């Protein structure tokens, strides 16, 4: 109909206006400005501890707030809590469903969350008078596989699923307080702000979106990729974020100015990106690839400064401690590695 | 050097390791099967005969099976298929009485072509290079009554034959089995079953026994 055509024309005109406004504020580039800064010295990191005990591929890994304990998830039906300093096992939690793709550790240290291929997010309580680990809540309101889950507090959680929608839950009740919609494809990753007031989501339509926890609607939409988006994370300041795609390219996006700052890609890289993380000061960007090795990039000058190569299979999960002292990497070889 | 509690912590870790090893040694003694289809291909009758994600368990002749049905997913297949990289066999179901039907979404495109392209996508995947496929063609009876009223020239406009129950079935089987592009690493089994049957379990038993023998031969370096 004519109304649909005129609405599409209006949408195209709004897109053109947004593009023109974005081009208006682009006066210079970071590369020219960062030319004068001293380059980062070539970096070597070594494997300090190796963690073994799994018997299948490892899909998820999340650090604790004390920078000593971590949690690992594999498709053998086990969720294992590791003490990194002494390489010990504190808890081994059996799971009813063995098809896991994500896990989360509560900031306080009282709960752990898991889920995947069963539309159910399970919360496990670690401190119990009976002396064991028990199920505290099974949230079931999604129609697709769960990609990522993050905690806001001991009685809140944010979840992204393959049903294009994201949800905010209340653990004590068990109901979706807010639902976020607007994507045109699957959702793979989400990142929480340090202020607990913003979060971004990345989708398989080459798009990132910014959401408010309270109000529940979208402010900004970022495009520029060419394939699926598999990882995303914030800069420690909170005014920028890094996106990793399946087209062998990472990009850095700014929130104050809705634009793209820098891209990180090399000719020899033809594989995808599975994990992205930052350092404590925001100078080093760590990326995990399917070429069985991880790379370190300078966040300002876009030059590679180091390669971590100790895994025999695809690197699936990468994490950096809160104090910025060690880096944890996992793979489908059923081994975790701590690098310093 | 360690204190009195560090030794107890190490003992707890050792006990956890022992339990994990004991559970892993038991989890490997199970046969795993992945069941696919095209929605109305007849999954229910197959499950009823041989009995997010659905898990089914059964036992035949001291062999323990474990069948995974993932028909109720409704998402992109390429983002979670690699989870099933080490499955013993894939059971594919095709309802061949849909050569005349058409899909609800489009009146120009028929269901059999969707089944064929899904089979082509699954067979030539990068994760299933050495995975056996067991193809069950379902509800042949309704086919044998329906073939006389309407021919199968509607689906394939390049078929010339006697238009009987045997020639059409042979043509369909040949068309399905010609989509394979390995012919050496992968082997395809075909069978015809109806609603009332009792020999499907024996067929899958023979197939999985052959796969087990081949895997053991490969493990010893003698293959």
């Amino acid at each position, epitope marked *: 109909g004519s109304e649909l055509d005129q609405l599409r024309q209006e949408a195209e005109q709004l897109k053109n206006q947004i593009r023109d406004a974005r081009k208006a504020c682009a006066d210079a580039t970071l590369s020219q400005i960062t030319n004068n800064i001293d380059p980062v010295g070539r970096i070597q990191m070594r494997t300090r501890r190796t963690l073994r005990g799994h018997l299948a591929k490892i899909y998820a890994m999340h650090w604790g707030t004390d920078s*000593r*304990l971590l949690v690992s998830a594999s498709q053998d039906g086990k969720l294992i809590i590791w*003490d990194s300093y002494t390489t*010990n096992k*504190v808890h081994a939690i059996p799971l009813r469903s063995s098809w896991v793709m994500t896990c989360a550790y509560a900031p306080s240290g009282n709960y752990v969350a898991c889920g995947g291929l069963d539309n159910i997010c399970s919360i496990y309580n670690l401190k119990t*008078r*009976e*002396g*064991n680990v028990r199920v505290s809540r099974e949230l079931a309101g999604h129609t697709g596989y769960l990609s990522c889950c993050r905690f806001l507090d001991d009685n809140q959680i944010v979840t992204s699923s393959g049903d294009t929608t994201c949800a905010l839950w209340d653990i004590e009740t068990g109901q979706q307080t807010t639902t976020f919609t607007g994507h045109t494809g699957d959702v793979m990753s989400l990142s929480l702000a340090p202020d607990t007031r913003l979060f971004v989501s990345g989708a398989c339509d080459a798009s990132a979106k910014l959401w408010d926890v309270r109000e529940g609607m979208c402010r900004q939409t970022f495009t520029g990729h060419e394939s699926d988006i598999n990882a995303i994370c914030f800069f420690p300041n909170g005014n920028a974020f890094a996106t990793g795609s399946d087209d062998a390219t990472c990009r850095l996006f700014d929130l104050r100015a809705d634009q793209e700052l820098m891209t990180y890609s090399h000719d020899n890289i033809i594989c995808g990106i599975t994990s992205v993380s930052f350092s404590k000061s925001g100078r080093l960007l760590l990326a995990g690839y399917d070429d069985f090795n991880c790379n370190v990039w300078d966040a300002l000058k876009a030059d590679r400064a180091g390669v971590l190569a100790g895994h025999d299979n695809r690197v699936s999960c990468l994490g950096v401690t809160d104090d910025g002292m060690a880096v944890a990497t996992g793979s489908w070889d059923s081994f975790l590695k701590i690098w310093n | *050097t360690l*204190s*009195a*509690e*560090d*030794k*107890a*912590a190490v*003992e*707890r870790s050792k*006990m956890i390791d022992r339990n994990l090893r004991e559970d892993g040694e038991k989890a490997a003694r199970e046969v795993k099967l992945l069941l696919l289809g095209a929605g109305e291909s007849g999954k229910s009758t197959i499950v009823k005969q041989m009995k997010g994600i659905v898990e089914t368990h059964f036992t035949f002749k001291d062999l323990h099976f474990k069948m995974f049905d993932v028909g109720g997913q409704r998402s992109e297949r390429k983002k979670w298929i690699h989870c099933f990289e080490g499955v013993t066999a894939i059971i594919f179901c095709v309802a061949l009485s849909d050569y005349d039907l058409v899909l609800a979404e489009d009146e120009e495109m028929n269901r059999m072509h969707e089944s064929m392209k899904l089979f082509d996508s699954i067979c030539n995947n990068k994760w299933f290079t050495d995975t056996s496929i067991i193809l069950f063609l379902n509800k042949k009876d309704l086919f044998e009554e329906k073939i006389k009223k309407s021919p199968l020239t509607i689906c394939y406009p390049e078929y010339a034959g006697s238009n009987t129950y045997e020639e059409a079935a042979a043509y369909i089987q040949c068309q399905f089995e010609d989509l394979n592009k390995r012919k050496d690493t992968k082997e395809i089994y075909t069978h015809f079953t109806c609603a009332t049957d009792t020999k499907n379990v024996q067929f899958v038993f023979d197939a999985v026994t052959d796969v087990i023998i081949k895997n053991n031969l490969k493990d010893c370096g003698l293959f």
Partner: single-chain antibody, 231 residues
Framework: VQLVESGGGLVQPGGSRKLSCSAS????????MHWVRQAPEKGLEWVAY????????YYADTVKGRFTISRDDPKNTLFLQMTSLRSEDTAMYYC??????????????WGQGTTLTVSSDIVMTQATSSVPVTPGESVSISCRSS???????????LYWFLQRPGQSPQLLIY???NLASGVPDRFSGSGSGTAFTLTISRLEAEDVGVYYC?????????FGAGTKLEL
């Protein structure tokens, strides 16, 4: 959760007898077990310890060779066999749970006690033996040892617990800085090296009893003489 023990009768100066304890409410197989002996009108001392899996068994020097420990996991029952009894083995016995991992709180439940009547080591010193007090004023108790309890890993193995009259001991503080579960925030602990202080800010009617400090660097486990507190 509750542990109930029995089997205690009167025996002649020469004989044998066995005691049993049954637990209900927790995973028994994942908890190590301790036996504690308290003499009449005296302090309490450690006797024996059995670990999870029955791999490590520890006895005291004063009872080595005479007492036997055993565990039954399917039936959830811990036994103790008294083979030869002197005249000094007349006391009341407790049963204590223990768990050991990063962040654990061992010696958390004590259960009840059973009475039995017959017809190198770190010394723990508490100089104070009685303290008169009026409710509403802060109180401090001091505890000292012969060797520093600080280890190379940064942990100090000091324990503070309480005993009410006609009741069983309850844990208050573990590792001299961590407040246990189910206890008010009034209590606090601190110290350094060999000197340790336990402070109570506000005292009420339920704070009257005997207080004990304990070490956990090495076996055997040694308790200190009680510091009674009177209203």
């Amino acid at each position: 959760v509750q542990l109930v023990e029995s089997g205690g009768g009167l025996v002649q100066p020469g004989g044998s007898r066995k005691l049993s304890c049954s637990a209900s409410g927790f995973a028994f197989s994942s908890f190590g077990m301790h036996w504690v002996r308290q003499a009449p009108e005296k302090g309490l001392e450690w006797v024996a310890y059995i670990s999870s899996g029955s791999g490590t068994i520890y006895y005291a020097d004063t009872v080595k060779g005479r007492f036997t420990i055993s565990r039954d996991d399917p039936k959830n029952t811990l036994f103790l066999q008294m083979t030869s009894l002197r005249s000094e083995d007349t006391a009341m016995y407790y049963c204590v749970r223990s768990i050991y991992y990063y962040g654990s709180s061992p010696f958390d439940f004590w259960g009840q006690g059973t009475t039995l009547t017959v017809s190198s080591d770190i010394v723990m010193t508490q100089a104070t033996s009685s303290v008169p007090v009026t409710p509403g004023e802060s109180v401090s108790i001091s505890c000292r040892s012969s060797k520093s309890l600080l280890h190379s890993n940064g942990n100090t193995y000091l324990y503070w617990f309480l005993q009410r009259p006609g009741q069983s001991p309850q844990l208050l503080i573990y590792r001299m800085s961590n407040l246990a579960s189910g206890v008010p925030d009034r209590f606090s602990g601190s110290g350094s090296g060999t000197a340790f202080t336990l402070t109570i800010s506000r005292l009420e009617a339920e704070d009257v009893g005997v207080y004990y400090c304990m070490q956990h660097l090495e076996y055997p486990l040694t308790f200190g003489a009680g510091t009674k507190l009177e209203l």
